Design a protein around this ligand. Structure first.
Ligand SMILES: O=C(O)[C@H](O)[C@H](O)COP(=O)(O)O
Ligand SMILES: O=C(O)[C@H](O)[C@H](O)COP(=O)(O)O
Lengths: 557, 557
């Protein structure tokens, strides 16, 4: 078996769930205890706004939370956290440190890897980013025909794309005066082609974002961009005014034709899905300004310190992690929905779909054992209120239990119509979790239909369809305003939630052998697509699909 | 007990699964049967391109498919389908016909509701749409200062938003000569504010899309748009030049102040999530032209005819439905992933999130009995190749079974670099489903670790982390090109998949009672947010969150 299932505190938790969970009814939990909100929420004062983590609408009692905290202690969460923060090589399959926390270590307390403090180099690259941002944003940096830069294009995929994309979308109001930012990621030629169609080579700056600098999609996209650029500029020296690199691989950057002076370095202990805090964040800093990028880092640092110093029973990422364990390993819920009531946060769910699933979508433990329990959930979601009109039907009246985190800023960036839109948005945010909790009893629906004027026949026909069973648990995460600082704190909070779950499951949150597999796969099929000859080298499906491609690719439509 | 679980063909299938499902291994199924692709795929010739539905990489034998087809028959799928097409009121809770098939009924064969052919009115509205499209696209339709329209803004939510958005995104290359299209949906004031910031009142035309014309989000957004417009135009009579309506409710359209000639009508038998084919698709027709809109309709009509005429055992939407039943009701898979290897299709998954989940996220059967089995899955996904770097880690190496549909056009709209990008994209599409099926054996990974120079100790430790169990089932759906016609067929195919699943579960795919409770509770909270007074009328969580909002909304950050 595996560490979690062999753990006596987990077996106690699970046994309690089997014996007692059917008796947990949210509506009744609240009625019985007027202090429920007070005892099952955290109001965090960061001194730059508050974050309220209200976990009271969860299927938990004091005893459940106690058992969960004991399990975290039994699973050695505190020691593991400390090991991450001190630069221990906790990425054991790759023998690497895990130090995204060093990237935003505003205190500058030394963090050592291999006896050497990483902070001087972290800060050197940040200084280089700051200087570069000033030069570009001021209009001082000129293109090959002597014009200021108007457009910045990040080329990268996965960890080198989604962070910068999500954050520049979320912090859009802070981009006034900054250059337009574009993200190219897919190898699909549509992505680069449609982007380049809107650009001038004279005023576009490309950012090639790649830890390895060998990823097929990114290097191919970069080469396509360079070819397009050089067709116009016709001068290799012009590349240095228009192409920069964010990477750990100096040799491959040089090979591509980028000046080492145009290279913004990061390190092997920065996981891609944890990399927006590093040089990978350059497009963020260019778009919103370095000061706002620093505020983002500072928010993360606040949350880092919260995670590091707070007792587990009052520790926000730990509690979120433990509630997840409860739903995943005791209730068996496959999914976790992230539902931010904020259009600017429209890529937040997608970001953590990567952050969570690539981290904890694992099945081998530190001991080499195959897990005999569930690990990471499927993470999904869309911003409210749109979701209410798309898939909430299923959340309310389907056959699935779906833990949801509802997120919203108190203050809107756009208080139009004297705040009318935000009032309605807030009302829906609140009402939805209330509804999921409370439901609507047959007798309550019966009274409603009676009042609506329905005949005894029509009422009886319609009744069961109008019943909401409720008891659907949510987190509500509410924050003063979505500033760069508060966003940094929220991202870091979920990063540490993911960390805690991974430790408890005894898996490595920080490798990605499935992703590494992917990068080895396409090479075998590529040459087989060339020419008209039939391919017989694979299974009949792969073969048949190739035959279809070859048969269909010359047809005129 | 419910209809499905009481069905003897279902009982046989479930019993077969219990006794035999451990014997099903994809690798073995292909090894034992060289005709597997040939017998477990459908190559559909539409006369406007081919659609290959390759379902061979699924955990099914000939016997399993036979059992599934028998179940579809004994659950009344053929009769239920015929009832939909004939205008029977199969939406039994609302007593409505279900006739999105009539909207695209290119044959013009009479379809009666209450003894009246609906086709004349369908065609009348289409004619009106065509005329309006000519007026706007030609530049003949002038704004209040006499200028041609350059921007169209659809305002709507859910069914009045996702379809038009997804289709205009997917068919972008077909929009030459068309006005720019914008989609405002969220009540969050960010959405309309950032949209209006980039527009001129002189050249913008708003399309107010609302079946009911009372949806709070849409009408509020519409009124905000009108306020912005009138600040510039300062003349209420100019509204008629810049606002049109897509509705079933003539009166409410008139109350808002729109010209009755500016109203594009649809009918109660057009479900919101099945509405893009109706007047709701006006923004599509404006963007890509009416001819292309007609091609979209014709593709759907082709698939309607395929669904209607084809024996179940070779009927594409039926087979897709049956595989889903197998994974949902026998394997217990909560989710279904849609993975288009196509940037233009980037909103396809979000569209069917509504189409699928709002239809089949249900728990009450036709008899009024509660289901005692799973219904609709959670639908999710992002375009390839991006997912390969992000959540495919979990698909390959997690603890969840996740049926995936991989979709791709053979021909790209942007064959840059002599087809290099598309070759790579196709190679990845093919290699990923192959790898999901095959995995990687210990003997294969061992040799890789050996060749990489890993020590005997390191190899031993790394090995299980590098092994992939495989046996992960997929569908591959490959089509000649993503044209308006082919896109229409693909959407219609999934519509009918959803229909078949709904009939088999004995649920109503066409109502949405589960949105009501959240709406009611939001109306109650809205006025409570105003002013400084404490709110105590709810549970302590709702009260506490409101208190936090009132306390935090005046804080200056
Ligand atoms: O998402 C993945 O983990 C990586 O970030 C992605 O494969 C890109 O890798 P690169 O930064 O080395 O190009
Ligand atoms: O998604 C829902 O089913 C509806 O389409 C949505 O609420 C919009 O309703 P309306 O078209 O009546 O405004």
């Amino acid at each position: 078996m595996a560490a979690l299932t062999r753990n006596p505190q987990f077996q106690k938790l699970l046994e309690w769930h089997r014996a007692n969970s059917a008796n947990l009814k949210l509506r009744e939990l609240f009625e019985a205890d007027p202090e429920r909100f007070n005892n099952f929420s955290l109001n965090l004062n960061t001194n730059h706004g508050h974050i309220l983590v209200d976990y009271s609408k969860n299927l938990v009692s004091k005893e459940v939370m106690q058992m969960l905290v004991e399990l975290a202690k039994s699973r050695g969460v505190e020691a593991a956290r400390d090991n991450m923060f001190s630069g221990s090589k906790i990425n054991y399959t790759e023998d690497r440190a895990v130090l995204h926390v060093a990237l935003r270590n505003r205190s500058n307390t030394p963090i050592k890897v291999d006896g050497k403090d990483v902070m001087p180099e972290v800060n050197r690259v940040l200084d280089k980013m700051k200087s570069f941002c000033q030069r570009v944003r001021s209009g001082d940096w000129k293109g090959y025909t002597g014009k200021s830069i108007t457009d910045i294009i990040n080329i990268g995929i996965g960890g080198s794309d989604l962070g910068p994309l999500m954050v520049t979308e979320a912090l859009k109001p802070y981009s006034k005066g900054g250059p337009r930012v574009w993200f190219v990621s897919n190898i699909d030629g549509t992505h680069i082609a449609k982007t380049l169609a809107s650009l001038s080579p004279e005023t576009s700056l490309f950012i090639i974002a790649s830890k390895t600098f060998t990823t097929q999609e990114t290097i191919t996209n970069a080469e396509t961009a360079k070819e397009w650029f050089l067709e116009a500029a016709k001068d290799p020296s012009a590349v240095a005014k228009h192409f920069v690199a964010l990477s750990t691989n100096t040799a491959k950057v040089k090979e591509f034709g980028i000046d080492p002076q145009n290279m913004f370095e990061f390190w092997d202990w920065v996981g891609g899905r944890y990399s927006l805090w590093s040089a990978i964040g350059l497009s963020i800093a260019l778009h919103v300004g370095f000061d706002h990028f620093e505020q983002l880092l500072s928010g993360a640092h606040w949350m880092d310190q919260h995670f590091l110093k707070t007792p587990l029973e009052k520790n926000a990422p730990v509690l979120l992690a433990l509630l997840g364990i409860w739903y995943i390993n005791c209730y068996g819920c496959e999914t976790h929905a992230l539902l931010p009531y904020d259009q600017y946060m429209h890529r937040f769910a997608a970001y953590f779909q990567q952050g969570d699933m690539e981290s904890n979508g694992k099945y081998i433990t530190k001991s080499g054992a195959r897990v005999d329990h569930q690990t990471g959930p499927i993470v999904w979601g869309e911003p409210g209120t749109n979701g209410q009109h798309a898939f909430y039907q299923l959340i309310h009246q389907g056959t699935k239990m779906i833990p949801c985190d509802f997120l919203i800023p108190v203050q809107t960036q756009h208080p139009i119509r004297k705040g009318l839109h935000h009032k309605i948005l807030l009302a829906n945010f609140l009402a939805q979790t209330e509804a999921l909790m409370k439901g609507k009893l047959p007798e309550e629906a019966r009274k409603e239909l009676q009042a609506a004027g329905k005949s005894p026949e029509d009422l009886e026909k319609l009744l069961p369809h109008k019943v909401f069973e409720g008891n659907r648990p949510t987190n509500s995460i509410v924050f003063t305003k979505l500033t760069p600082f508060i966003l940094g704190a929220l991202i870091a909070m979920y990063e540490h939630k993911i960390f805690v779950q991974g430790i408890m499951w005894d898996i490595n949150s920080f490798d990605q052998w499935g992703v590494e597999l992917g990068k080895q796969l396409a090479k075998k099929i590529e040459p087989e697509l060339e020419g008209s000859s039939a391919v017989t080298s694979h299974d009949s499906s792969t073969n048949g699909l190739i035959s279809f491609i070859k048969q269909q690719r010359d047809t005129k439509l």
